[PDB]
Design a protein around this ligand. Structure first.
Ligand SMILES: Cc1csc(Nc2ncccc2Oc2ccccc2C#N)n1
Ligand SMILES: OC[C@H]1O[C@H](O)[C@H](O)[C@@H](O)[C@@H]1O
Length: 448
C-alpha cells in the first residue's frame, strides 16, 4: 500500500470529473463571448469552416501536416458522391525536422518546409504544376479568414523565433517564393481537429466534433453562429477550435495538479501554459511516468532505491513505453525489455509497480479527457431539441488509437458524463491531409 497510496493521488471521483466538465463548459462560454475572449484560456478560435458549404472543386490537392514531430506532405484526390464529396490520399512523404531548424527562426523553419515540398514534387512528376494547397497546422491560430490567421504561440515544444504574431499562410508563401523552384495556390489553412472532423463528414453527416489525443490534445466542434461572437452573422454553423489544451492556465485545475505535473510544467518549453494538455498529451505522458518512477526510488520502494542514469534524464521514458507496458500480457517480458533498455534490472514486483504507475497516469489522462469532451458534447446538447442527441466525434492521435485501454476507459467515462446523448466514435483515415483537401475543395469555388 506504500506504493498504492502514492498512486492513489492520481484517482478522480465522479464528482471530480463533473467539476472539470462544468468548469470546461464555463471557460468555453467565456472564450466565445467578446468581453471575455481576450483573457479566456479556452480561446474558442473560429475556423471559418462553415455549415452551409456552397461550392467544391473536384480534382487534385496538395496537403501539408505540420504539428506532428514529423512534417508530412501529400497529394489527395477529391471527387463527388451521393450527398457529399469523397477524397483519397494518393502520394505521401514524411520528413524529419532537425534540431537546428526548430531552434533558429520562422524563416529558417519555413525554408526547410519549402525544400521538403520540392523534394516531394520532383519524386512524383509533379514539379511543373501548381496545385491547390491545403495546410493542416496543429497550433493555435487567430484566423481572419479560411486562408489567413496569425500563430498565437507555439505549443508541444516547437520553438522557432519570430513566428508568434505572424500570418502563417504568409510565412509559407514568403519561403515558397524565396525559393522560385516551384509555386502553389495556398487555398486553406486548418487545425488537425478540424481536418479530422471534415474527413469524417462524408460517411457521417452527424460528425460535428473533432478530437486529437496524440502528442497534444485538443478538440473542435460545430457552434451556432449566434454564439460565435467574433464572427458577424447568425446563419447556420461554424467549426470552432477550442484549444482546450490551455484549460487550467488561469488556475482552473489548481486543486488537481500533482507534484509531478508542477515538475513537468516548470521543465517544459512553455511553463504555466497548456496545463490540461500536459495531463493527457503524448509529449507529456511518459515524462509523468518517469517522474512518478523517480519519486518511488527516492522513497526507496522501487528498483531497491537505485535509479539508472538514463532514468534520471528528461524525456528518456517515452510515451510509447507507457503503451507497451500496459500491453504486457502478464509475463513481464515487455516491461523487462523496456526497463533493461533503460539501463535497469527490475524484479517481479518492480515491473508490477511500473505497470501500476503507467495505469495511474494513463487512466487519469482518459478521465480528464472524458470531462472535456463531455463539456463539449453537453454544451451542444443545451442548443438541441430532440429527446436524445445523436452525435459523431471524429478522433485521431497515437494515445487514443494505440494505447491499450485509453479508448475503452475514455468512452465509458464520457458516456457516464453525457446522459441523453448517443455518441458515435469514428477514427479518421488520413484525417489531416484528406481534411485539409476537402476544405480546400470548397474555398476553391469560393476563389478561382
Ligand atoms: C468555408 C468552408 C470550407 S469547407 C466548409 N465546410 C465543409 N466542408 C467539407 C465538408 C463539410 C463541411 O461543412 C460541415 C461541417 C460539419 C458538419 C456539417 C457540415 C455541413 N454541411 N466550409
Ligand atoms: O495536435 C493536437 C493539438 O495540439 C496542440 O494543443 C495545438 O495547440 C492544437 O492546435 C492541436 O490541434
Amino acid at each position: 500500500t506504500l506504493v498504492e497510496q502514492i498512486l492513489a493521488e492520481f484517482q478522480l471521483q465522479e464528482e471530480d470529473l463533473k467539476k472539470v466538465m462544468r468548469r470546461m463548459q464555463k471557460e468555453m462560454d467565456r472564450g466565445l463571448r467578446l468581453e471575455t475572449h481576450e483573457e479566456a484560456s479556452v480561446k474558442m478560435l473560429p475556423t471559418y469552416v462553415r455549415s452551409t458549404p456552397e461550392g467544391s472543386e473536384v480534382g487534385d490537392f496538395l496537403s501539408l501536416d505540420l504539428g506532428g514531430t514529423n512534417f508530412r506532405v501529400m497529394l489527395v484526390k477529391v471527387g463527388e458522391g451521393e450527398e457529399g464529396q469523397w477524397s483519397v490520399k494518393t502520394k505521401h512523404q514524411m520528413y524529419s525536422i532537425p534540431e537546428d531548424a526548430m531552434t533558429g527562426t520562422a524563416e529558417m523553419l519555413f525554408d526547410y518546409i519549402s525544400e521538403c515540398i520540392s523534394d516531394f514534387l520532383d519524386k512524383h512528376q509533379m514539379k511543373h504544376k501548381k496545385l491547390p494547397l491545403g495546410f493542416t497546422f496543429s497550433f493555435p491560430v487567430r484566423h481572419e479568414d479560411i486562408d489567413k490567421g496569425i500563430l498565437l504561440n507555439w505549443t508541444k515544444g516547437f520553438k522557432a523565433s519570430g513566428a508568434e504574431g505572424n500570418n502563417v499562410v504568409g510565412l509559407l508563401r514568403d519561403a515558397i517564393k524565396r525559393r522560385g523552384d516551384f509555386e502553389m495556390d495556398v487555398v486553406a489553412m486548418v487545425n488537425d481537429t478540424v481536418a479530422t472532423m471534415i474527413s469524417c463528414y462524408y460517411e457521417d453527416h452527424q460528425c460535428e466534433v473533432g478530437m486529437i489525443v496524440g502528442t497534444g490534445c485538443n478538440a473542435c466542434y460545430m457552434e451556432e453562429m449566434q454564439n460565435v461572437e467574433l464572427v458577424e452573422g447568425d446563419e447556420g454553423r461554424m467549426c470552432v477550435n477550442t484549444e482546450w489544451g490551455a484549460f487550467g492556465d488561469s488556475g482552473e485545475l489548481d486543486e488537481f495538479l500533482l507534484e509531478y505535473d508542477r515538475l513537468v510544467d516548470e521543465s517544459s518549453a512553455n511553463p504555466g501554459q497548456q496545463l490540461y494538455e500536459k495531463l493527457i498529451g503524448g509529449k507529456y505522458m511518459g515524462e509523468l511516468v518517469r517522474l512518478v518512477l523517480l519519486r518511488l526510488v527516492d522513497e526507496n520502494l522501487l528498483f531497491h532505491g537505485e535509479a539508472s542514469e538514463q532514468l534520471r534524464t528528461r524525456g528518456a521514458f517515452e510515451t510509447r513505453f507507457v503503451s507497451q507496458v500496459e500491453s504486457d500480457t502478464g509475463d513481464r517480458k515487455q516491461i523487462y525489455n523496456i526497463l533493461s533498455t533503460l539501463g535497469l534490472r527490475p524484479s517481479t514486483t518492480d515491473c508490477d509497480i511500473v505497470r501500476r504507475a503507467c495505469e495511474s497516469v494513463s487512466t487519469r489522462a482518459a478521465h480528464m479527457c472524458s470531462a472535456g469532451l463531455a463539456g463539449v458534447i453537453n454544451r451542444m446538447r443545451e442548443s438541441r431539441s430532440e429527446d436524445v442527441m445523436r452525435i459523431t466525434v471524429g478522433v485521431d492521435g497515437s494515445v487514443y488509437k494505440l494505447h491499450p485501454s485509453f479508448k475503452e476507459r475514455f468512452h465509458a467515462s464520457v458516456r457516464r458524463l453525457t446522459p441523453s446523448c448517443e455518441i458515435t466514435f469514428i477514427e479518421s483515415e488520413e484525417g489531416s491531409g484528406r481534411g485539409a483537401a476537402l476544405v480546400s475543395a470548397v474555398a476553391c469555388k469560393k476563389a478561382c
